[PDB]
């Protein structure tokens, strides 16, 4: 598995606009909301859940990095794997996307897989 | 269990105004105090205790997130479970509320369950 | 045991003026110096020793919180247990006080036990 | 082995211009892009993979230090070992350089091996 | 052993002017360069190596603290044990000093062991 696998989805030139932390079924988790920096498009929602999914090893790295990029409001590419979380009420509040990666974006390019 | 369960309570458009750390019965703990950004209402007090209650696994995550929102002073939704802590001098100093989640808010919406 | 036990001492409306990190007998330790915000009185010195005493589990939490309040210079309540540390030159350089809690005091009262 | 070994390469007076975090084969990883502070030359790309290569033990230290130097925009010397990473798609997006060390610089010199 | 043992050395009112992170012989390490705030004397270099020397338990504590003091530029007292590291090339680039403690200073006194 890799953040960059073409079975994962990504969204470029986004800003993390909201951050949430909680717990589900013994797992601390966090979710982020991101919107296009130019103000267009539809928001993206993705979550990371501690000890849950193949992406569990990266939970702390992603939490720390989402925190940083959130605090600067800088433009980023968000990488997700769709249809991972299955609790329907959780999915309805947030989404089923597992967050799998984060890349800074310049005015010209995003530093990550495409 | 989930932050979003309707057996938990929540308060929106609050700011973390005080923060305390300590230890009880060999467990690190922290408490926060939040007030409405607009000055109305009464304060919310909630505590997390590192090896107590079902919310134990997210102690560190909530401590780090509470520090972040405290240092920025931004408006948040605080999620609590009432009537958890039982030590009377502790409850009277702070409250019986366990802290179970923190959601950032924009001017119009809070990014978390409701 | 609890930060708020009446066998412990506390000093309100202080600021953290100095911070030291070191090691003794294979244990990381830190100490802080605090003074009344208003200049009155004498300083308080207290240390946490990572591997020693019932307060050991709270070492990291206390160090992280000591660092943050040190960096802001905001008013705090410092909570200590007196006469616990024993190495004579250590006590004489610093003190025999264990640091057992830190409360913010940005308001009328400090947010912690008294 | 050592960051300063003959058989590693280094590039001085660089600024960390991009940062990416992800996961590959159960291992969190991060990559950075650096460019010369004075605008000259060609960008350097280097990655660290938490469970892989002889540099694995330093993953957390390098991640934290890369993050700090990124957040400050300050001039650094970057040390890499060439031809480490093998997954072709990964190398194409980023590079095969393993990050093995970061050194801060002043105007004239960098504090690290030469 | 103790940071404050009189067999250790210390340098008061120093500014942490450079910082380096790397790896050696399986261990993450970091080194710092300090200079007297008043401009006098010679720079001090000291290093901490994860899981090496008696001071290994304090590696993360000292790294975090060295980062903080490095980022502020404030005046500090640096405590070292001399002649600890033996890698020849490593010592040539940096020094043999193990970092064993850091103390903040006011303009008139450092909050740490002396003598």
Kindly write down the DSSP assignment for every residue of B32-92, as one continuous string: EEEEETTS-S--EEEEEETTSSTTGGGHHHHHHHHHHHHHHT--EEEEEESS----HHHHH
Q: Which residues of D touch A50 (CB under 8 A)?
A: none
> In 10 A of CB B38, how many CB atoms?
10
Mutate: best of B22, B24, B32, B51, partner C, most C CBs <10 A? B22
Instruction: Please say whether the dihedral angle defined by the alpha carbons of residues C55, C61, C66 and C67, taken in this order, is positive or negative.
Output: positive
Nearest C-alpha of chain A: how many angstroms from D110? 26
Nearest to E94 by CA among D81, D55, D111: D111
Calculate the dihedral angle through the C-alpha atoms of C106, C3, C71, D110, rounding to the nearest 10 degrees: -160
CA distance C111 to B46: 12
Partners of chain A (3+ Cβ pairs below 8 A): B, D
Work out the end-to-end distance of chain C between its first and last CA atoms, rounded to an integer number of angstroms: 15
Q: Nearest CB to B4: which of A21, A27, A93?
A: A93
Report the SS3 class of residue C58.
Answer: helix
CA distance C78 to C13: 9
Angle between helices D59-72 and A59-72 (to 10 degrees): 0
Whether residue A27 contacts residue A49, with contact meaning beta carbons closer than 8 Å, is answered with: yes
CA distance C24 to C7: 26
CA distance A56 to A27: 10
Q: Which residues of D touch E16 (CB under 8 A)?
A: none
Q: Nearest CB to B111: which of A18, A50, A87?
A: A18
Report the SS3 class of residue C112.
Answer: coil
Closest chain C residue by Cα to residue E110: C18
E36: domain CATH number is 2.40.50.110
DSSP A85: -
- Give the tokens for residue E85: 């590291």
CA distance B92 to D56: 49
Whether residue C15 contacts residue C73, with contact meaning beta carbons closer than 8 Å, is answered with: yes
- Give the tokens for residue A49: 């859940």
Whether residue E75 contacts residue E105, with contact meaning beta carbons closer than 8 Å, is answered with: yes
Whether residue C19 contacts residue C72, with contact meaning beta carbons closer than 8 Å, is answered with: no
Instruction: Please say whether the dihedral angle defined by the alpha carbons of residues A97, A103, A106 and A111, taken in this order, is positive or negative.
Output: negative
Structurally, chain B folds into a number of domains equal to 1
Q: Is D1–E23 a contact, with Cβ atoms under 8 angstroms apart? A: yes
CA distance B23 to B35: 24
Q: How was this structure determined?
A: X-ray
- Give the tokens for residue E25: 């012989």
Report the SS3 class of residue B17.
Answer: strand
> In 10 A of CB D6, how many CB atoms?
7
The dihedral region occupied by D25, where left means phi > 0, alpha psi between -120 and 50, and beta the remainder, is left
Whether residue E56 contacts residue E50, with contact meaning beta carbons closer than 8 Å, is answered with: yes
Which H/E stretch holds residue E22?
A: strand E9-24
DSSP E97: P
Nearest C-alpha of chain A: how many angstroms from B21? 20
Nearest to D12 by CA among D87, D92, D82, D113: D113
Whether residue C19 contacts residue C67, with contact meaning beta carbons closer than 8 Å, is answered with: yes
Q: Is C21–E101 a contact, with Cβ atoms under 8 angstroms apart? A: yes
Say what the resolution is, in angstroms: 2.0
Work out the end-to-end distance of chain A between its first and last CA atoms, rounded to an integer number of angstroms: 15
Residues 50-79 of D with CB under 8 A from A: 50, 63, 67, 71
- The burial class, CB within 10 Å (0-12 / 13-18 / 19+), for E110 is buried
> In 10 A of CB D73, how many CB atoms?
11
Which H/E stretch holds residue A61?
A: helix A59-72
| Domain interval for residue D94 | 1-114
- Give the tokens for residue B70: 């405290």
Q: Nearest CB to B55: which of A23, A50, A63?
A: A23
> In 10 A of CB E21, how many CB atoms?
26
Place of tokens 């690190």: B28
Query: Which residues have C-beta within 8 Å of that of residue A109, sequence separation ≥ 6?
Result: none
Partners of chain B (3+ Cβ pairs below 8 A): A, C
Q: Which residues of E touch C22 (CB under 8 A)?
A: 2-4, 58, 79, 100-102, 112
- Give the tokens for residue E83: 């002649």
> In 10 A of CB D55, how many CB atoms?
24
CA distance A31 to A35: 14
CA distance E90 to E20: 12
* CA-based R_g, chain E, Å: 13
Place of tokens 């589990």: C57
The dihedral region occupied by A39, where left means phi > 0, alpha psi between -120 and 50, and beta the remainder, is left
- The burial class, CB within 10 Å (0-12 / 13-18 / 19+), for E40 is exposed
Q: Nearest CB to E23: which of D57, D111, D114?
A: D57
CA distance E18 to C67: 21
Cα atoms found within 13 Å of the Cα of residue A30, Cβ hemisphere only: 28
CA distance E31 to E93: 10
**Strands (E) located in C1-93:** 9-24, 27-36, 44-49, 76-81
Closest chain A residue by Cα to residue D20: A103
> In 10 A of CB C3, how many CB atoms?
27
């Amino acid at each position: 598995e890799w953040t960059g696998d073409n079975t994962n989805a990504y969204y470029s030139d986004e800003v993390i606009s909201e951050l949430h932390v909680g717990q589900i079924d013994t797992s601390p988790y966090f979710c982020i909301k991101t919107v296009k920096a130019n103000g267009s498009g539809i928001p993206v929602v993705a979550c990371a859940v501690s000890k849950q999914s193949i992406w569990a090893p990266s939970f702390k790295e992603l939490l720390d990095q989402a925190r940083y990029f959130y605090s600067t409001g800088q433009s980023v590419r968000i990488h997700v794997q769709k249809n991972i979380w299955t609790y329907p009420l959780f999915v309805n509040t947030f989404s089923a996307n597992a967050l799998v990666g984060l890349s800074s974006c310049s005015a010209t390019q995003c530093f990550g897989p495409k």
